[PDB]
Symmetry: C4
Subunit: 108 residues, 4 copies
């Protein structure tokens, strides 16, 4: 599943570290699991970038759905655009925090 | 009617209330009906005041249905906050229902 | 097929006549053929608006694909946004003309 | 190689030549291969210079495959002119292949 590498990719993007983000992405492309990489990058776009740059989510979902159809090797070019966009995007996890607060606030 | 309470809260630009009713609807467990209603709200209550909100809403909700819970709640949160904060218009909805009434 | 009403809708949008565009759209919604209405509005977005407003095509395809899933009656609200957008959009059919010129120019 | 001639014409920002090779490819009749290549060109040759071009390209080509000919040629024309006129970047492509080479 390469969950260790997926975690390193999320930390790299959260830390706005574009060279490390591309390195961990390269390791996942060589391993060949496009579905798990597309799923994690979609979650990162909404969790870590979120409301700071809504257009990053449009470009991420569009590229990753197209990538899963095109398949490797050409899919690596679509993924490269996504990873650079997310690593160098303004970022806010406030949507994630607000959602979990609303769930915690429900009467039990 | 929790879906109608969510629509009223988004129309009123009330982020905290909108997320409260969203949390209740996530726990009630009908994602298709929540997604359908948020899509309608984006075109009915935001509409021409902020067309980008419709692209954000449809993109996030289609992706949310594909990734499922638990992560779908994060995508839904982005949609609900966007719609609650967005400028508001009912002009396209009104124009359409005026034109349909004119046929009779 | 209501091809007469679909033709009147295209002429209404080409002529930037928003009230006539909504009237012909209303007639097609009452008739109930969402697929034929979605197909014609997609072609109008690329043929008549085209390169003058590329974002009109993104908003049109997004709304109409969502509409065909939601179904009437709520689909009328999505379609209303599309028809007003296209009727009041800047317009150029230059992509249509250039494509047909390139086909006519091929050696035979 | 007509697909490679189309890529060279788009890279050179040559609208007339790009539409010439597109017309040849439409008549040759393989829409899936033309759509795949134009999608790759949008991310490889335009890339970060104009991200909107990728949204336009994927949206139009998916719709073109769904509506078929004859109308698909109009959607394809919008894509090819957009990519030929667009600002050009290979920076994302290069960065990705540099990172993959660094693994070895
Ligand atoms: Cl994951
Ligand atoms: Cl038609």
């Amino acid at each position: 599943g390469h969950y260790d590498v997926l975690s390193a990719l999320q930390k790299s993007i959260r830390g706005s570290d574009v060279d490390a983000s591309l390195h961990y992405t390269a390791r996942l492309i060589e391993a060949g699991d496009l579905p798990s990489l597309a799923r994690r990058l979609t979650v990162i776009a909404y969790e870590d970038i979120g409301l700071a740059n809504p257009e990053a989510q449009i470009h991420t979902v569009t590229a990753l759905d197209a990538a899963q159809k095109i398949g490797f090797p050409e899919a690596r070019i679509l993924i490269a655009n996504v990873v650079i966009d997310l690593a160098l995007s303004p970022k806010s996890n406030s949507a994630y925090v607000a959602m979990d607060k609303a769930l915690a606030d429900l009467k039990t």
